[PDB]
Ligand SMILES: CCc1ccc(OCC(=O)N2CCCCC2)cc1
Ligand SMILES: CCc1ccc(OCC(=O)N2CCCCC2)cc1
Ligand SMILES: [Ca+2]
């Protein structure tokens with residue numbers, strides 16, 4: 001009776017792990033495709049499954065970090081969203097913290113995404129007329145030539161500066177989608193998706 | 205590209221169906237065991253997965269009805285919970301509506317559970333001092349000898365009447381748990397649980 005209960009709990013943990021990988025893959029695909037409503041609904045399912053998991057492997061923590069990173073990027077222009085206990089941290093600042101914590105290679109693409117999130121974290125404040133908040137985000141992030149241009153734009157209150165058009169929100173999204181394509185290729189072979197794909201193929 | 209997107213969506217529907225059955229089995233087990241917090245967390249996961257499913261088979265609708273029925277029974281004493289668009293309907297009345305909609309045999313146990321939910325739907329109002337609400341629940345449900353005793357208890361404001369101790373909330377819960385055991389036996393062979401169980405067994 002107690003051994004049965006324990007074996008059932010172990011099986012529920014195995015199934016939750018399979019469900020987390022599948023939901024991460026669905027979330028990545030919705031982000032890549034721009035399917036806003038599917039992303040919202042999948043994020044809700046991923047959060048609920050995560051609250052039912054206790055012990056995590058290094059791989060499951062990385063998968064969770066990727067889900068959290070994409071959620072903050074999707075909410076990057078929503079300055080009323082509070083993702084951290086410190087209410088001053090903006091969504092792109094929260095995405096930057098996660099980006100620097102994921103156990104992943106620090107290749108050229110990693111650094112390009114990092115710097116585009118930093119510029120846009122300031123740009124989104126400027127675009128909403130939040131000039132003092134842009135200065136505070138700048139101080140938290142920066143924590144020389146790149147830093148100096150940003151402080152100049154902030155002090156001029158140059159909301160639609162040409163610098164923000166060369167390192168735009170769309171360019172940040174496109175670089176992030178390139179990274180998402182690599183996660184989709186790596187997780188396409190996860191148990192639930194493979195089994196579901198085999199079922200669909202066998203009926204064709 | 206469009207055929208690939210369509211095949212991916214079909215696989216996501218297959219996986220969501222497997223996830224719904226697994227979450228129903230986990231929800232049933234938490235209800236049977238009295239694991240209140242696991243029931244709450246599993247209900248959250250089941251609701252989110254359900255919102256990501258569009259077309260349902262007759263079997264999936266029955267599985268969803270069972271999840272909804274157990275949620276209303278678990279909230280039976282929570283008279284501030286509103287499960288229907290009509291705010292007057294109490295949680296046990298909402299459970300009674302679902303019980304009469306499930307495609308299932310109407311054996312002796314089905315009717316015993318039905319009548320215990322009817323008595324308790326009135327009993328829970330009386331126990332909270334809501335005498336006028338008990339009369340209104342009575343009129344919505346009833347909709348001869350059984351009906352007459354209840355109307356007499358309601359009019360006397362006999363909160364802790366002996367009739368409610370013979371057909372108690374605990375007796376209703378125990379009869380419902382007997383039914384839950386049959387659902388657990390029928391869904392223990394679902395894809396995700398079987399595969400998870402095989403993994404756990406292979407490591408023993
Ligand atoms: C957006 C997806 C999401 C993910 C997790 C979460 O809460 C849990 C949480 O933060 N951790 C921290 C990381 C390890 C798991 C527990 C809420 C929402
Ligand atoms: C408690 C579990 C739960 C289940 C379903 C749900 O909403 C969806 C809903 O009602 N239907 C009606 C029945 C068919 C699916 C759509 C909310 C919570
Ligand atoms: Ca804010």
Ligand SMILES: [Ca+2]
Pocket residue numbers: 283284285
């Ligand atoms: Ca009420």
